């Protein structure tokens, strides 16, 4: 807004994995406001895939969200007959924005049946830089190399 | 002379194909969805690990 | 050897008796944990029990009125740490750093007339 | 082979061109925004003039020329990002200058843009 700046809010850490990025990433999950259901399938995909792979629940996690972190994007101004996408470097909490939620609705778009396993085959997969969330940190990473020439037109 | 007649036929066609071929300038332009036989697995073109 | 304290958030008040004893919390008839349907609750509502670092050396004994399950799993809160500047006052420091003895005013808005709700507008169009 | 040649740099508000040439005008090798294929505005930028004169020292950096003092020459957004990528490629920079036409009144020039 014109007049200035203002907060956010800051969440305390789940129960249980003693992190605040899987309190953040309920709010990713949540919809309509029902914590409620949202917690069944967060809980339940963290030993639906700790059983398929080997070593903790929280470290197969923290790496199939730092696959995702994009670290360009572009962003765009006008010219009078052009448009021009500008590529921008992003903050260290815009990344951390995108990557939960570049993981949390790349998820209902997956052929699995109950939401507790499509989010645990996209914890699992995107773990090995592979699919949907961590092609679109390389969608998103073209876009600001094609666009290097219009670097000069920054803010 | 055919191999343009039947070029247009599959890209005027508005439902799903499974194109299996081997000529690189006509599955070149219409490069939507890559599978693909590496080992013994079909693999995708969402598979940003190669570079 | 019992202490006192009243807290409040949103609607629900709850009357909580701090004793002398071991971990254990008891409301309205029930073990909490029949009472609250999240772990998430029950993590915080013992918020104050992990500033002062006295983790377990009370049983709790509350008494709830109003509200649902957030809101009186949190003016909980407010009665663990309302009876506890009363036994030793001179917790008071760092009970208060945490922004534990706010009472949170936050509650629900009025409807206003011709909107659909608080603040939520009929749809536009122009012509 | 060849050591000691003179950089070219060319560049006006469509495109750069860069050529390396040794010390007779011999023209060892050129290239150029456009070549590498970039299409209008951005033909014209600084990213792209330091492509162009990179891909061009590096091949004729193989005949062994290390040292090579630059010409500037016409109005450019892009000129000055050509002589970090020279530079940079290796190349030693010796001493350089605009070389630009300037009329001592001569012929009548085109008409302005409306």
């Given at each position: 807004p014109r007049k200035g700046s203002v907060?956010?809010?800051?969440?305390?850490?789940?129960?249980?994995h003693n992190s605040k990025l899987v309190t953040k990433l309920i709010n990713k999950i949540m919809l309509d406001g029902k914590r409620g259901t949202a917690q069944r399938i967060l809980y339940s995909a963290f030993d639906l895939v700790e059983q398929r792979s080997g070593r903790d629940a929280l470290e197969v996690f923290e790496e199939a969200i730092n696959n995702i972190m994009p670290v360009l994007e572009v962003k765009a101004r006008r010219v009078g007959g052009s448009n021009y996408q500008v590529p921008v470097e992003v903050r260290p909490e815009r990344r951390t924005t995108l990557g939960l939620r570049w993981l949390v609705n790349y998820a209902r778009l997956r052929g699995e049946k109950t939401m507790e396993d499509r989010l645990a085959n996209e914890i699992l997969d995107a773990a090995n830089n592979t699919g949907g969330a961590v092609k679109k940190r390389e969608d998103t990473h073209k876009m600001a190399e094609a666009n290097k020439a219009f670097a000069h037109y920054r803010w | 002379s055919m191999q343009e007649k039947i070029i247009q036929l599959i890209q005027s066609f508005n439902g799903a194909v499974i194109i299996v071929s081997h000529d690189e300038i006509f599955k070149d332009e219409i490069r939507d969805q890559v599978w693909k036989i590496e080992n013994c697995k079909l693999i995708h073109e969402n598979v940003s690990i190669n570079t | 050897?019992?202490?006192?304290?009243?807290?409040?958030?949103?609607?629900?008040?709850?009357?909580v008796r701090l004793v002398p004893g071991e971990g254990n919390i008891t409301v309205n008839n029930r073990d909490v944990r029949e009472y609250l349907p999240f772990e998430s609750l029950i993590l915080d509502l013992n918020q104050p029990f992990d500033v002062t670092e006295t983790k377990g050396n009370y049983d709790v004994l509350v008494n709830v009125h109003g509200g649902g399950f957030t809101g009186q799993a949190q003016a909980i809160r407010h009665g663990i740490a309302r009876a506890l500047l009363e036994a030793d006052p001179e917790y008071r420091g760092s009970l208060k750093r945490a922004g534990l003895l706010t009472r949170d005013p936050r509650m629900k808005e009025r409807k206003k007339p011709g909107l659909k709700a608080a603040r939520r507008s009929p749809q536009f169009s122009k012509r | 082979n060849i050591e000691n040649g003179v950089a070219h740099i060319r560049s006006t508000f469509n495109n750069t061109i860069v050529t390396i040439t040794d010390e007779f005008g011999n023209a060892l090798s050129w290239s150029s925004a456009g070549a590498?294929?970039?299409?209008?505005?951005?033909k014209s930028t600084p990213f792209a003039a330091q492509m162009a004169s990179e891909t061009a020292s590096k091949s004729a950096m193989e005949h062994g020329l290390k040292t090579?003092?630059?010409?500037?020459?016409?109005?450019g957004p892009g000129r000055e990002s050509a002589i970090r990528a020279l530079q940079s490629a290796g190349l030693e920079v010796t001493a350089i200058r605009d070389v630009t036409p300037v009329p001592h009144n001569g012929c009548r020039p085109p008409k302005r843009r409306r």
């Open positions: 907060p956010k809010r800051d969440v305390l850490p789940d129960p249980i | - | 050897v019992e202490y006192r304290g009243t807290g409040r958030r949103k609607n629900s008040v709850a009357r | 590498l294929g970039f299409k209008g505005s951005k090579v003092e630059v010409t500037v020459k016409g109005p």
